[PDB]
Design a binder for this molecule. Sequence first.
Ligand SMILES: NS(=O)(=O)c1cccc(Nc2nc(OCC3CCCCC3)c3nc[nH]c3n2)c1
Ligand SMILES: [Mg+2]
Lengths: 256, 297
Amino acid sequence: DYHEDIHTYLREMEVKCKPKVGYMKKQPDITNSMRAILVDWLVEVGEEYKLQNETLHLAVNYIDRFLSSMSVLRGKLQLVGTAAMLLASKFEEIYPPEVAEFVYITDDTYTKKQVLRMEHLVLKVLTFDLAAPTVNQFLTQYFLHQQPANCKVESLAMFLGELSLIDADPYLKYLPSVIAGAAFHLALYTVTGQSWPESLIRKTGYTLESLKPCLMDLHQTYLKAPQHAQQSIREKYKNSKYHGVSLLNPPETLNL
Amino acid sequence: PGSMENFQKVEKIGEGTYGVVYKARNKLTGEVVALKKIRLTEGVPSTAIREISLLKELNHPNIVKLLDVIHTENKLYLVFEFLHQDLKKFMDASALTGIPLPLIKSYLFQLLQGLAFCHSHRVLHRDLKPQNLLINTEGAIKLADFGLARAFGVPVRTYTHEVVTLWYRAPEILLGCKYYSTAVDIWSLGCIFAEMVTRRALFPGDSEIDQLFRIFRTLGTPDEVVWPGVTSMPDYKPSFPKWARQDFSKVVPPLDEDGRSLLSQMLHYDPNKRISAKAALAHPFFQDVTKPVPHLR
Ligand SMILES: NS(=O)(=O)c1cccc(Nc2nc(OCC3CCCCC3)c3nc[nH]c3n2)c1
Ligand SMILES: [Mg+2]
């Protein structure tokens, strides 16, 4: 159903929509850890308002692109994240939370006027280019290649793709299609012992060899997940909605 | 690149999904434009956010061109290429002549091109109706008013239920399917194809049930044969009258064999079997297609 056309188009757009890999080094006042805290909070916001995973992925794309060009003081990072989540929700959700809900969830750190002004600024800086490819949009296509469909594989891949959002180092250097490739293989391997399928080599041009760097990073993230300072994704993926996949044991080795 | 300073307002055109559209002229280049004004509450409306983001990606001869976005803190102005008329008004103006078949064929061909482009760029229009299809004096027709549009995913998840103007709304939406996709836009275009030929709406219902029943009386009440899964759809009722399907030659009598074939594929009940815009471009109906100027204005 236009599946090939759309995949090709997203592969073009993800390159165009990619944040600057090196931006955090060039931010005077904010760090990767502060960004980790922000994204983990957004996961919680997403859970609170029962937002789509897609909405979360979009907001993080908006933040990283915004921070790729705009210097932001630590006390304003949450305002940037908040406006990004409001925009993502308006773009993606059937029923986005009201602006007042977004004001409320900062616990009155910021005013409605500040959130709305930031919304406008984020739109200006991104030149209204909000239809960005996400790890989620690629995963969802890759799932169509399962034989047969496995709910644990799907949810676990989504979980792993979500973990990548937390840590700009290293995941900012990988494209959404590649993170998704690594997440799907790692999930499929964890659950069923199967590997990145031949049909996806044909679709994407990616092999286990080309996915290896991302895979090694993601495997480490997966193994270390229970010890990460940020736990909101692990907690979220305990839910039956995601078939409790965060309780699955990560494979000790990948044998690649 | 623009500023409101170089635009001279000419006249109000109308109100679509949101905002208001004015005809204007760039004083410096002479370009005539359509200006969509948005008063800025809840901040920038989701309809604006979607229309702008998606139209910036959708550059195509049969999609209205968004030229610029002029942003004040109180006002948002969308600068669009100007087209001369809408399809509804043109059909009204053709009351006594009819629309020449070469022009109907050309317009459908162009609409399908424009639509295939949207769908290949993961965009659903969701409000295809003659009022939103704009024509110029050179023979072009273009998709406009992307206020109800959205970026979709592969495969789709559940999107907004309250979509498409009733007369053009697909049976899968009317019956409450959890999933709808690109087939909804084809349904609308199929209704519009028929309307260009008869100059009256194919299915002018005044409620959702009336709409469904008008569709059933024309295409037959769908069973599990024609549309596997119909009977388990959320808003299907076993009490629906079971109308026999009519001879398609009677649905749009001036249409000849090829035209009828195409229309029937655009109005297939099962969204899976309903023809894609991409596939429809190669339909034998279009073997002699050209792009003549409108016969009026
Ligand atoms: N004969 S007329 O008055 O000059 C005339 C008549 C109808 C349409 C136009 N041109 C025109 N209209 C738009 O939106 C009009 C809008 C469409 C949706 C429903 C409400 C009205 C456009 N958006 C980009 N370009 C556009 N061009 C000109
Ligand atoms: Mg820094």
